Structures are given as C-alpha cells and as structure tokens.
Design a binder for this molecule. Structure first.
Ligand SMILES: Nc1ncnc2c1ncn2[C@@H]1O[C@H](COP(=O)(O)OP(=O)(O)O)[C@@H](O)[C@H]1O
Ligand SMILES: Nc1ncnc2c1ncn2[C@@H]1O[C@H](COP(=O)(O)OP(=O)(O)O)[C@@H](O)[C@H]1O
Ligand SMILES: O=P([O-])([O-])O
Ligand SMILES: O=P([O-])([O-])O
Ligand SMILES: [Cl-]
Ligand SMILES: [Mg+2]
Ligand SMILES: [Mg+2]
Ligand SMILES: [Mg+2]
Ligand SMILES: [Mg+2]
Lengths: 351, 355
C-alpha cells in the first residue's frame, strides 16, 4: 500500500494528507524537531513539502534513505546559484545574473544588469531590490551568500505546475497567472486554455528540467512574461501556492497528483474545463461571512493568525464567468482592505 | 473554532470530518465503543451519522445531550411506523401500508396490498437490510419477533426512484440540490445520476413535501427524501435525517457538498443554495477491493472509506462530473472492464441516462 511520510509540518503537508485520505493513501506530515520514532519512515515513500532543512535527529535518518523521492535533487534547487546554473546549462531563458561576491562588484553589476539589481539569498529566501545609490543597505552578510540579477520588467507573472512520473511521462495544468504584493503571492487566476505559445514554451522548459533532474512528483516553474517570451524566475520542487486552485478547479489536484507520482499510481492529464481564482488569506482571521457566497471554497490551515502569515486561501471556479466575477465583487467588502486590489486584478483578467 | 462530535464513526462521519477540516471545523466521528470521558462532547455541537443506535456508555451520554441537534426528532423518523404516519398527516403520498402486527392479518395484507408484500423493520434497517419481499406462500420466512415490529407496504412498480437532498437552517430557511436518480439492486444503492436542472414539476413537488416535513419537525441540518416515480406522481419512500448515500456526488459536483451543508446548518453558518452546473454520476463500491486502475481515468474521483472489505459492505464510491457528457459516457464505458461483473448493469444504467 500507500503509506507516505511528508517532511515538514506546514499547510502543504496538511493539504497533501487531506488529498490522500479519500485515495486510501495514509499521509504522515512530520516536523523537523520530531523524533525519528513517530515517523513510519522505514515502511513509507518519503517526500517533503519544504526545500531545505538542517540535519536534525529526524533528518539525519533521512540521509541516503532509499524511499526518499528526489532526496538528491532538493539541494540542487535549494541553492539559487546551482538552480540558476541549471537553467544556464539547459540554455533556458532566465534573468541575467551573477554570484554577488563583494561590494567591489557593484559598478559592473550595475553596468551589466541595468539600473535595478534584485539580490536574493542563495538559500532560505530574503530579497533586496537596489539601485546604485542604495547599495549600503545590503547586509554585509549577503556577500558570497546571494546572487544578484536583472530586475525584470515583466508584463505579468505565470507559473506552470506539472508532474513527472517514474517512467518519465509528464502532465501539466494550464498556466496560472499570479500577482505578488510585497513579495508575497496574493492572487492567482487560471484559464482552461492559456496562450498557446506560452503554454508550449513553459511545458517544454519544465519537461526539460524535470528530465534533466530525473525528478518524479509535482514541480512548479514560476516565470515572467516579457516581449521575448517567458523567462524562468525560480522552481519549487513540490506542490506550490500558485496551484491551490486545482483543489476545486481540476479533476485531479496538484496534491493528488504529487501523491500519485511518488507512489507510482496512474498519472493521466488532469481535466480543467473552467477558470478558477484563488485568493490567499494572509494574517487575517477566519470570517465565515465569506461562506455566504456559494462559489467560495474556504481552505483554512488552522495555523495561528499572525501578520504576514499564510493562514488559508479561498478558491472560486465556475463555467459562468459573469457569476464568478460577480462573486469576487461581493467578496471584496467581506475581506480586509488589503485584499481589494488583488481581487480587482483577478476580475480584470476576465475581460 | 467550530467543534462537532458525531454519533457514529462510519463512512458518513468520516466524510463529514473530511468536509470540515478545510472549513476550520474540527469534527470527531465517535464510535459507539468510545469512553465518554475521552470525547469532548460537552464542549461541542452534537450530531449523528446513524438513525438508530444500541445503548452503550457513549450513546447514553450523547443522545440525551442538549447540544444534540434534532435530538427529539430522531425518535420519530427512526421508527418507520411514526415516519409513515407523519407522511399521512401531511397529506404526503406514500405506499399503502400498515403495521404488521399478527399472522392473522396476512391474508388481508395480500388482499389489500397485492401479490408481494414489502415488510420493513420499524427501526434499524438501512442498505436494504431489515426488509423482506414476500408472496403469500412465503410468510413463513418472517422472524416471529417481526410481528409488531415491522410495517408492511404494497410493492410499488415505480418507473424510477429519485431522492431530494436538502437542508433547513436554524432560521427556517431551506436549500436543495437538484433531484438525484438512484438505481438499487437487491435493495442496496448501486448508482446515482444527477442533472443540473431536473423536471421542474417533480422538483417543485418534492421540495414542497420535504419543506413541509422539515418545518413540521423543526429540523436543522441535512435530510434526504427518497421517493418513487409512478404514474400518479411521486410517492415518498423514506427519509434519512442526515447526509445520505444518494448525495455523495455533491462532493465533486456541487459548489457546497452535502457534508459541508450539514456542518453549516448545525453550526449556524451561512446556508446559501449550492451551485450545480453539470451532471454527475456516482458508482457505489460494494464488497470490492480498491483497484487503482480506476485512477487511469482522469475524471474519476475515488472516495475509499478505509473500511474492511467484505460482501455487501459499502467500501467507497466513485464520482464523475463534467460538462461534456460524452466524456462521462466514455469514462463509464472504460470503467466496466475495471470493475467486478456485477457492476456492469448499474454503470450501463447510468450511461443510458445520457442517451
Ligand atoms: N529579477 C527579478 N526581477 C523582477 N522581479 C523579480 C525578480 N525576481 C523576483 N521578483 C519578484 O519577486 C517575487 C518573489 O521572488 P522569488 O524569487 O520567486 O522568491 P520566493 O522564493 O521568496 O517566492 C517574484 O515572484 C517577483 O514578483
Ligand atoms: N414499497 C416498496 N415497493 C417497491 N420497492 C421498494 C419498496 N420499499 C423499498 N423498495 C426498494 O427497496 C429500496 C430500499 O428500501 P428503503 O425503505 O429505502 O430501505 P433502507 O432504509 O434500507 O435504504 C428502495 O430504494 C427500493 O428500491
Ligand atoms: O517560494 P514561493 O514563495 O512559494 O514561490
Ligand atoms: O439505505 P438508506 O437508509 O437509504 O441509506
Ligand atoms: Cl448528517
Ligand atoms: Mg516564488
Ligand atoms: Mg521560492
Ligand atoms: Mg433508510
Ligand atoms: Mg433507502
């Protein structure tokens, strides 16, 4: 049978466990502080809902564990330097970049990357956007530990969520449009038919990366839409926030898909017929008033509400798009004010 | 948060728990063997996933608790004699029947009710168990203790069976799903098919009947009303004061499932009308082992109950829903060679609805 242990105790692991239950797959999400005992590791397929972790009592036991799918891929992707090098190695479009080694480097960096430099920690996410006058602000700790790239002026951001099976087969969801405010995802919208050139471009780059890594399971590739096409921003070797809409807007969710892949169950293409919109709930308390609107699917994480914390998400799907945007309209006043703009941005794509 | 304890830990209680977790409602399906001291029922909204129960330490405490929504209603619906009298009281058409109280009545039963008598136990029957179909020559098959504890009805030659699944809130408001077409074989549900828009007249009559019942009883939560489609219209077959097998398709084919609807009603949350745009088909899995080959068909939603697999036991269901019905028929076709032989007729029966 289907026994799965998930390294990491956050909402992604919870949604995976909720997904496996009606499939008859028992999923055990475990925190890094756990005792290796309470972990049915020795008889499970092992996966993670996190990207990197230190050696802990529990994790040490996971080192070289043969049931840990993709065990060896994580670190390649967890360090932005090696992740960017992978795109370069595959000749995949990505923002121009370099290791930011020393303050010495700034003028050339500016010369070459343009006016705005996006500095990102190599591991553990962690970002600064700087102009030549502002460089002092970057902590001295970053030198040697961050990459820096051209700030991309994209028209929008989209991510491709898909999965690759042990046999190399691949399946994908339509691209999803995502809006980030203060570096965090606030809203996502997916249409059953995306721009065909874009979709094709994304599936070919993601297939190429998954094949290269020998990856099995769900992976998300976030990209920037530019006049020249998509540029790859970053990868997530796991189910990703942008794909949550799949819980109610696809015949197979990203959670079920990930489980199917790693346990070697059937991996047909998920069916997506209507559009969906996802609104992330961040630092807000649950408001059951939202459930007055029948299209609203509430996904509460049962985490403590704190500022800037992802506490849940709302999914809405419908073949009637007038009904859908009307609902979004009705939802606005039921949410705290900082939600409005991302809702309006979502409604705008239905035009 | 919302905290709910359910009397019973069968598949219905499990699916109510699954529905609640994402809404932030902690739901505890409680087995009848639980020690009351070990269940937070005194701090919860209490409900039931079963109609009747034996007396155990846990049942004694829960069933009398003031937090048990519809506590005083269950007795009436749970006994088929009072359930039928209730239909009669509200002028609700139903099969001619009477209480089977003594052998001396048999001949009158047959004279009045026709060639086959349908005997149902007054309480504890579900899944087509606690029911016998008898010809005059077979009354010997009836357990002596049945006399006085069973009702007997005319065998109705319905052209089809449909059920109305709906809910009533503390505020008296009600919402309903479209009618669900149900196929039973050997008295157990095998397949359900629901369409976004049902026969309006039939949908209107059924709703009128269930609204009458729920309001007479002062019922809060989900209720299912199973009927027979005959040439004189619908007749009510029986009621289920809870989420019901024929409503399972709502997990994937409606915007709010029957499980979420029941939790909303009982916890006093909003009760809007669920949105249903496409048809859905539900295939019940009875006494069969799980076969992951089913997942090779992308529209299939597997709902495995993690229950012991043995003859006549409901072990899960498969839901399929899509706007393209050709997709559905095609998937139903593909499922036949992936299921035990006894499933073919029910699957074909569902495919037939779309042609
Ligand atoms: N080079 C860049 N140019 C412009 N914006 C960027 C660039 N890199 C990141 N961003 C913006 O920052 C967001 C978060 O950055 P990302 O690298 O995906 O970090 P994280 O791992 O924290 O999600 C992006 O989705 C995008 O909005
Ligand atoms: N009077 C009746 N006439 C013909 N068939 C009936 C009658 N009562 C029940 N049945 C058949 O038996 C099925 C189960 O009966 P029901 O009373 O619903 O019992 P249960 O509570 O076990 O589900 C019905 O759905 C129908 O197919
Ligand atoms: O990393 P993210 O943030 O999920 O993208
Ligand atoms: O069997 P039921 O009672 O109908 O569920
Ligand atoms: Cl119920
Ligand atoms: Mg990102
Ligand atoms: Mg990231
Ligand atoms: Mg019954
Ligand atoms: Mg019944």
């Amino acid at each position: 049978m289907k026994q799965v242990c998930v390294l990491g105790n956050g909402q992604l692991g919870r949604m995976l466990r909720q997904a496996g239950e009606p499939l008859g797959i028992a999923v055990w999400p475990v925190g890094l502080d756990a005792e290796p005992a309470a972990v049915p590791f020795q008889q499970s397929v092992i996966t993670a809902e996190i990207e990197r972790w230190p050696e802990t009592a529990l994790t040490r036991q996971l080192a070289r564990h043969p049931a840990f799918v993709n065990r060896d891929v994580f670190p390649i992707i967890a360090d932005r330097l090696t992740q960017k090098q992978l795109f370069d190695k595959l000749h995949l479009p990505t923002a121009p970049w370099q290791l930011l080694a020393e303050r010495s480097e700034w003028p050339a960096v500016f010369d070459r990357l343009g006016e705005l430099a996006i500095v990102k920690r190599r591991t553990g996410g962690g970002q600064w956007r700087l102009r030549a006058n502002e460089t002092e602000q970057l902590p001295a700790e970053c030198y040697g530990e961050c990459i820096v790239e051209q700030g991309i002026n994209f028209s929008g951001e989209v991510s491709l969520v898909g999965a690759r099976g042990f046999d190399g087969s691949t399946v994908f969801y339509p691209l999803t449009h995502n809006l980030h405010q203060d570096g965090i995802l606030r809203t996502s919208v997916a249409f059953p038919q995306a721009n065909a050139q874009q979709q094709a471009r994304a599936e070919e780059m993601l297939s190429a990366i998954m094949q290269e890594l020998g990856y099995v399971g769900v992976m998300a590739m976030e990209c920037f839409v530019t006049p020249q096409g998509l540029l790859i921003n970053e990868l997530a070797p796991r189910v990703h926030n942008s794909g949550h809409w799949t819980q109610n807007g696809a015949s197979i969710s990203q959670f079920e898909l990930h489980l199917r892949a790693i346990t070697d169950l059937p991996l047909p293409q998920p069916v997506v017929n209507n559009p969906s919109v996802m609104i992330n709930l961040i630092g807000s308390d649950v408001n059951y008033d939202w459930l007055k609107l029948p299209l609203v699917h509430l996904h509460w994480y049962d985490k403590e509400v704190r500022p800037g914390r992802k506490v849940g998400h709302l999914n809405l799907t419908d073949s009637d798009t007038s009904r859908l945007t009307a609902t979004l309209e009705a939802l606005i006043p039921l949410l705290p004010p900082e939600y409005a703009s991302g809702v309006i941005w979502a409604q705008s794509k239905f035009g």
